[PDB]
RNA sequence: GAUCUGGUUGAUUCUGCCAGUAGUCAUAUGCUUGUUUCAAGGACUUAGCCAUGCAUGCCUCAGAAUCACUGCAGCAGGAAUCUGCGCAUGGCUCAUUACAUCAGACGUAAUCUGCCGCAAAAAUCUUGCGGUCCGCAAAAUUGGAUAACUUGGCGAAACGCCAAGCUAAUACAUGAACCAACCGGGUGUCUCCAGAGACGCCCAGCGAAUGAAUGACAAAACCAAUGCCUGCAGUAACACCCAGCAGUGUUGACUCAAUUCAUUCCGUGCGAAAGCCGGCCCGGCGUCUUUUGACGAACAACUGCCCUAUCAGCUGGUGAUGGCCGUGUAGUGGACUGCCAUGGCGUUGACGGGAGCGGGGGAUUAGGGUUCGAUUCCGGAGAGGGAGCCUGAGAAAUAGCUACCACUUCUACGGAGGGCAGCAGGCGCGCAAAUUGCCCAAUGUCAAAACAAAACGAUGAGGCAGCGAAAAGAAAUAGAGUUUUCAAUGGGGGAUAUUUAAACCCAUCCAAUAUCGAGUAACAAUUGGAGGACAAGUCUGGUGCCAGCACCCGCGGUAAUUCCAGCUCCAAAAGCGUAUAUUA
RNA sequence: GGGCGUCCGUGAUUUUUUACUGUGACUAAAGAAGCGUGACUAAAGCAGUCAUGACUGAAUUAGAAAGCAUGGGAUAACAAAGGAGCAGUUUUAAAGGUCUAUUGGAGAUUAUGGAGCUG
C-alpha cells in the first residue's frame, strides 16, 4: 500500500534503485485524518503489537493550558485561525498540531475569578488571595481578549495520531508573532 | 544431505607418469615388501611426506616456541611409538631422513614375515588377510597395519585360528564329512 | 521468530555431537541468553546420564523432578546459565552452573548450606512505579529494594530460599571477578586497574593468583569476593588457574602412562 | 619437490606459441566391476508444466459432554464440536539484486516485542431481604446468546449452504460495599489567637494525552513576618497524630526513569477468570492490567566488493540536496502535503549496459597468487507473473484471502475449482541427476501434552532402506613344499541367533551333545598402449598415400618400429579411456 | 589541630593529527592446522579406559580488511605560514569607575570589603 521505504527515491548520484523484494508490512503508511471542526466522531486504528491509535475526525473540544498558571481548562473550539503550512487548511478548519484557534475563554475568567479573587467579595473568612496576587501579574494582551470572549490558543497534541485536540494559550512574542500576522 | 561425516584422500599420484628410475624402484618395493599395487606405496610416500613437511617447518620456529616444544615432541612420540625411529634419535633431524622403506618395514605383512609366523611375505598377507594373525588377542586382518613397539612381543597365531587353539579349517573338516557319510 | 536450532548453530560448549540429528533443543527465552545457557534437557541428558533420550528425558522434567533455583522447571527448554542451582531431592544431588577454566560449563557439587545461596550480578537500576528502586540481574530476577550502596557493576547474594538479598559485594579494585565471556572465560582473577572510556566498553585489567597479567572488557567480569581466598563462592577443580598447553600436555601422558 | 619436455633449421642460438603432463568434494560419456566402509545425487537447460497420494496440528489430575455412544453397578472411558495456543517456524529454490544484499563492527536515547523469566497490584456503593427512595444485613448463590445435536432441508456438485428448535464456558457481557492503609490538592461553617485546630464538601489508583514544577550542587547593618534562648548560645526539614516514613533515579549524554498538580480518558485499556483441579485450612494450576530482562522484529549505515568509456555527464516541472511548520509511522526521516532556498553526485569512473544471491568456505598454491561458491551453517529474497489485504505479538503469509493476466480441472451448463522452487513420482527440456518405499525408534518442533493404566498426539522436518563406479577409505582373484601332494578362507549358502522401530548391512558362527562348501580354485580382470615426449617389439600375417592412425611431431606410395590383426611386453588396476570447463 | 599525597565527579587556564610499528580487548560451528585415543587398520568419530564405581576426556592454534584501547617517534603525510603580512616580567602604595559568602533561618532593602577594570 502506501509505503515510508527509500525504494522508490533516487539515490543522491541520482541513479535509479532496482527494487528486489516485494512491499513490507513493516513499512506502511496510512491515510490521513484530516481533522476537522465539528461533533466528535472518531475511528480507532489497530496499530502494531495490536496498540490502538485513535483517528480524530470531526474535534470541537479540548483541554487548553494556561502555562504561566499551570492549569487547565475542559473549553470549546470555536474557530481555526492561522495555519502555518497552508491558509488552505484555516478555510476547510483542518485541526493539526501547532495550528492556531480560538477558544471559549468562559472557563478562564471564572477561574481567574476563583483563583486570584479579580472578575471582569463573598468568602471574607479565606483571603489567601491576599498571599497570593501581590509577586503576580498578568500579561495585557492576554486579558485584554480573555474579555473579549475568545482566546487564540495553540494546538499542542497531535489528532490524527491521538483522538484529542489539546492545546496551550498564545502568550508572550507568540502572542504578538501570530497577532501581527492576522490583522 | 545433511550429512557431516568427514573424508579425505590418503595418497596422491605421481608428476611424471613414466619415469624410468621411479618405476624401477617401485617395483622393487612392490616385491620386497609384497603389495599389491603402485596406491598403496603412494600412501606410504604421503605419510612420510607429511611428516617430513610438518617437521621441517618446526625446524624453522626456534627452540623454547610453543609449537615447537609441543608439536614437535609429538612427531618425535608416534615416531618411536610405531617403529620409525629408534630410541636414540630424538633431534628431530632425523624424521626429515625416513624412507619409504623405513615406514614399509612396520606393516603387519613385514613383521609376520620378520617374526618369523610366515615363510614368505606372500605366505604373510595371505594368513593375515585368512585371519591368522592376532597382535593383542585381536584378529587383524589389514595387511596395511602398522605395528607399534609394543605390539611387536604380542604378535601370534589367533586364539581361533586353526594353527592356533582354534577347530580345523577347510580342507581337513570338508575331508572329516566325506569319512563320515561312510 | 525462530523455533528451530540447528545442531551447528548450538553452542559449542554444550558438546552435542554433530552426527546425531539435524536439531538442538533451542532454548526458550527466560533468565539467561541462547547463545549463554545450558537447557535443561542438556543437563539431564547429556552431561548427567540420567535419561538416554529426550523420551526419557521429560519423563523427569514433566512430572516435576528437577528443580532450578528452588523451583521446579517442567521445561526441557528452560535456559539454565551461570551461577543458578540445579537441586534434585529424588537423587540427592544438586549442582551449581560453573565455568571451568577452558571456559566450558561445569556442574560444581554443593551442600545444603552452599545451596541456598546465588550470586548475581547487576545488569541495570532504576525506578518502578511509586518510588521503589528495583535492580536488574543477569539471571532476570528484578530485586525491588536492594542494598542502598547497589551500583551497576555490583555483585548481590541471594539466598533464593528466603527470597532476602543477604549481602553485597561492590566492584572496586580490591576485588576478585571470575571471566564470564571471551578468550579468558572461566577464569579468575582479582582486579588491577579498570580502564573506562566513556562511550565505548570499559577494560577492565586482572591478575591471576599465579600473577598471570590479562584483560577483558568489564561488561565480561563477575566479582564473586573480597579476595581470592574469600570467595564467596565454590569454583571448579582448577580454581581459574590456566595451566600451560605444553604442560598439561605432558601431565596426561604421564597420568595415562602411570596408570599402566 | 620453488622440476619441465616434444614441435620453426642443412645444423645453431633465441623469441614465441601450439602439444605433452599432474590435480578438481567438476560434470558428462564409453568399456569393464567379486567383497566391505563412507557418501553426493533435476543446481546448470525450462524460477518450465504438473496426474495421484501425502507433507500441521494440539487434552491433562487441572476450560465446555445428557452422542438418543460405550463398559460398570452414579463412577470411569469418551465420538463430535465450542474454547485456548500453533500454523510467520521448519522444508525447498536461487529468479531477482551493486550507496542493494552480505561480512566484521557499531547504533536504536528513533522504535514494536505474544510464548518465557523475575516482579508489581489498596481505582470501581455490588449483592440479599423488607418496604417507596430508605432500612437491616453480607463467604456477592449475576445475565443474555451460540455450536455440537435434533427437525425440515436446498444443490448435479463444491475443504458449498439455509431456517427453526435445545444447551455449556476459562466464549461473550456484567460486577464486587465494609473489612482495607498511607499520602496530596482545592474549598465552606465552628471552638480559639491578636493566625492555629476540629468538622463538612468536591477531587485524589495503574496506564494514556496536554500543560507546569523536580530530575541537583561543584564581613556586617536595618524594618516586617518567624526560630529557639531567660539579647541571641546550637541549629536536618515539619504547627500535634510518623520528634529521620527518601533533602539522594540512571547514563558518556536525555525533553528519559520516577514523583508532585492542572485538566479529561467515553471504548480504543485495567475481574479477585463470577475459573479449574488436588490433598486432609493448605497446595498445584489458569488468567486480566502494569512493568521490565530474555528470544526476536524493524530501521540506520563505518570499511569492503566482477567486467564495461564502441556508456561523461547524473539528478531537479510530477523530490532531486537541504531548511521550516505539520502529516504518517511502531518509530527516525523528502517517507509525504504546503512553502522557501539552489543544491547534491562524478575521471579517486557518477550515470547507463552485461554477468549473478552474499559470506563462512572449496580447488590449486614456495612466496605473491589464480579461480570456484545453485548446494548442508548464517543472512537476504521468492512461492506461476503482478498487485492488494484481512487476522494476529509477528505476514504484505501463499498446503490464507481478493482481483486481473497467462495456462488450467469438474459440470446434470445453472455453476464450481486449480497453484509440487514440500516429499515420492509424471511429461517435457537437455550432455546431464534416483523409490508414486518403511517409520516416528533417534534428533527436534508444535501443544491443552511425562510414561503407564479400557487408554500408542501430529509430523514426506528428520531418520531408515531401495536405486547410486559423483568423490572418498580398506581390500580378494592365492599360499607352502617334494611331474606331485599338503594346508588355508573368503565370494557364496545358512542360524540357538544378533542387529533394527521392523527388516537390511555389517559382526559373529559352521557345534556348545549335535551345523555347508574352491581347483581348469570354470568362483576365469579389465582399460589403454609398444617410433619420440613417455614406460614397453629392429616378432608374424594383411592392406599398399587406400583403409585408417596420429592431442603435437608425424605413419601409410608392395620388406609399415605408428593402420587392421595374432603373439609377446609396458603402464595403471576394480578400475581405465575420452570430451568440456578450471588450477599448477 | 597543620603537612603530605591519592580517589571520584564539576568548573577556569593556549593548539596537533594521520599512515607506520609493538602490545592488548573483542571476534559461530561445520571446514583448515593437530593434542590425546589400536572404532581390527584407515577414511572417520569424540569418545572412552580400567577392577551395585572409579578417573574421566572433548587441550590448543591460524582465520581478510575495517572497528576499540594503549606506547614507540625513523620515515613519510595532512594542515598553515611566505616571515613588516610582526605576538616585559615582577615588588609597592595610589586615583577614578564596574554588574556571590557571613550577621540563627527565610524575605526585602544596605553601606564596607575580596578579587578583577582601565588612565
Ligand atoms: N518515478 C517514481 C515516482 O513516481 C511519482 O509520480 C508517479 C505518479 O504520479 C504516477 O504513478 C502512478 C501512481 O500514482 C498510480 N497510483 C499507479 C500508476 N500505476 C502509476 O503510473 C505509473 O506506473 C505505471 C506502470 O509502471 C505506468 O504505466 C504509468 O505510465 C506510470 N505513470 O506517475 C509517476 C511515475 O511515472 C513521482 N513523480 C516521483 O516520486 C517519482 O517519479
Ligand atoms: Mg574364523
Ligand atoms: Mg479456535
Ligand atoms: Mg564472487
Ligand atoms: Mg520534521
Ligand atoms: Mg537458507
Ligand atoms: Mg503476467
Ligand atoms: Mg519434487
Ligand atoms: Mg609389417
Ligand atoms: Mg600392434
Redesign the interface.
Given at each position: 500500500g502506501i509505503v515510508r521505504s527509500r525504494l522508490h527515491k533516487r539515490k543522491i548520484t541520482g541513479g535509479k534503485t532496482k527494487i528486489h523484494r516485494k512491499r513490507m508490512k513493516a513499512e506502511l503508511g496510512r491515510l490521513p485524518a484530516n481533522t476537522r471542526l465539528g461533533a466528535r466522531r472518531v475511528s480507532p486504528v489497530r496499530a502494531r503489537g495490536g496498540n490502538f491509535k485513535i483517528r480524530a475526525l470531526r474535534l470541537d473540544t479540548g483541554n487548553f493550558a494556561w502555562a504561566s498558571e499551570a492549569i487547565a481548562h475542559r473549553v470549546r473550539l470555536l474557530d481555526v485561525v492561522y495555519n502555518a503550512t497552508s491558509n488552505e487548511l484555516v478555510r476547510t478548519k483542518t485541526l493539526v498540531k501547532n495550528c492556531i484557534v480560538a477558544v471559549d475563554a468562559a472557563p478562564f475568567k471564572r477561574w481567574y475569578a476563583k483563583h486570584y479573587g479579580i472578575d471582569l467579595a463573598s468568602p471574607k473568612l479565606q483571603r489567601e488571595w491576599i498571599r497570593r496576587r501581590r509577586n503576580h501579574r498578568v500579561e495585557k494582551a492576554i486579558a485584554d481578549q480573555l474579555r473579549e470572549g475568545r482566546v487564540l490558543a495553540r494546538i499542542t497534541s497531535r489528532p490524527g495520531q491521538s483522538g484529542r485536540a489539546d492545546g496551550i494559550l498564545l502568550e508572550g512574542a507568540e502572542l504578538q508573532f501570530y497577532l501581527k500576522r492576522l490583522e | 544431505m545433511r550429512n557431516y561425516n568427514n573424508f579425505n584422500r590418503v595418497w596422491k599420484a605421481p608428476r611424471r607418469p613414466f619415469e624410468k628410475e621411479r618405476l624401477d624402484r617401485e617395483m622393487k618395493l612392490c616385491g620386497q615388501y609384497g603389495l599389491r599395487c603402485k596406491r598403496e606405496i603412494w600412501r606410504v610416500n604421503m605419510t612420510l611426506s607429511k611428516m617430513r613437511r610438518t617437521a621441517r617447518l618446526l625446524l624453522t620456529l626456534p627452540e623454547n616456541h610453543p609449537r615447537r616444544l609441543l608439536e614437535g615432541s609429538a612427531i618425535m612420540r608416534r615416531c618411536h611409538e610405531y617403529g620409525f625411529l629408534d630410541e636414540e634419535k630424538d633431534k628431530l633431524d632425523y624424521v626429515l631422513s625416513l624412507t619409504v622403506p623405513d615406514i614399509l618395514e612396520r606393516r603387519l605383512q613385514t613383521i609376520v614375515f620378520k617374526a618369523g609366523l610366515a615363510k614368505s611375505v606372500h605366505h604373510a598377507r595371505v594368513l593375515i588377510q585368512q585371519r591368522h594373525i592376532a597382535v593383542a588377542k585381536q584378529i587383524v586382518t589389514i595387511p596395511s597395519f602398522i605395528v607399534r613397539v609394543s605390539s611387536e612381543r604380542h604378535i601370534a597365531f589367533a586364539d581361533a585360528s586353526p594353527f592356533g587353539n582354534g577347530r580345523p579349517g577347510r580342507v581337513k573338516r570338508v575331508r572329516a564329512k566325506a569319512a563320515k557319510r561312510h | 521468530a525462530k523455533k528451530h536450532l540447528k545442531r551447528?548453530y548450538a553452542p559449542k560448549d554444550w558438546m552435542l555431537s554433530?552426527?546425531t540429528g539435524?536439531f538442538a533443543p533451542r532454548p526458550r527465552p527466560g533468565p539467561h541468553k541462547l547463545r549463554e545457557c545450558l537447557p535443561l534437557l542438556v543437563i539431564i541428558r547429556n552431561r548427567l546420564k540420567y535419561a538416554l533420550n529426550a523420551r526419557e528425558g521429560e519423563m523427569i522434567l514433566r512430572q516435576g523432578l528437577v528443580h532450578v533455583d528452588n523451583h521446579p522447571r517442567r521445561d526441557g527448554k528452560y535456559p539454565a546459565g551461570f551461577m543458578d542451582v540445579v537441586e534434585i531431592p529424588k537423587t540427592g544431588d544438586r549442582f551449581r552452573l560453573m565455568y571451568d577454566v577452558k571456559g566450558r560449563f561445569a556442574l560444581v557439587s554443593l551442600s545444603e548450606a552452599e545451596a541456598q545461596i546465588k550470586l548475581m550480578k547487576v545488569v541495570n537500576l532504576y525506578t518502578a512505579t511509586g518510588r521503589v528502586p528495583v535492580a536488574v540481574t543477569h539471571d532476570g530476577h528484578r530485586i525491588r529494594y536492594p542494598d542502598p550502596h547497589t551500583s551497576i557493576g555490583d555483585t548481590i547474594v541471594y539466598n533464593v530460599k528466603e527470597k532476602k538479598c543477604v549481602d553485597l559485594i561492590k566492584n572496586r579494585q580490591g576485588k576478585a571477578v571470575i571471566v564470564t565471556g571471551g578468550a579468558n572465560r572461566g577464569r579468575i582473577g582479582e582486579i588491577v586497574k579498570v580502564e573506562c572510556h566513556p562511550g565505548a566498553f570499559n577494560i577492565a585489567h586482572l591478575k591471576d593468583a599465579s600473577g598471570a597479567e590479562f584483560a577483558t572488557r568489564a561488561a565480561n567480569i563477575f566479582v564473586i569476593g573480597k579476595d581470592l581466598n574469600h570467595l564467596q563462592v565454590t569454583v571448579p577443580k582448577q580454581q581459574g588457574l590456566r595451566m600451560n598447553?605444553?604442560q598439561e600436555?605432558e601431565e596426561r601422558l604421564i597420568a595415562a602412562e602411570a596408570r599402566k
Open positions: - | - | 551447528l554433530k552426527l539435524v598447553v605444553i600436555r
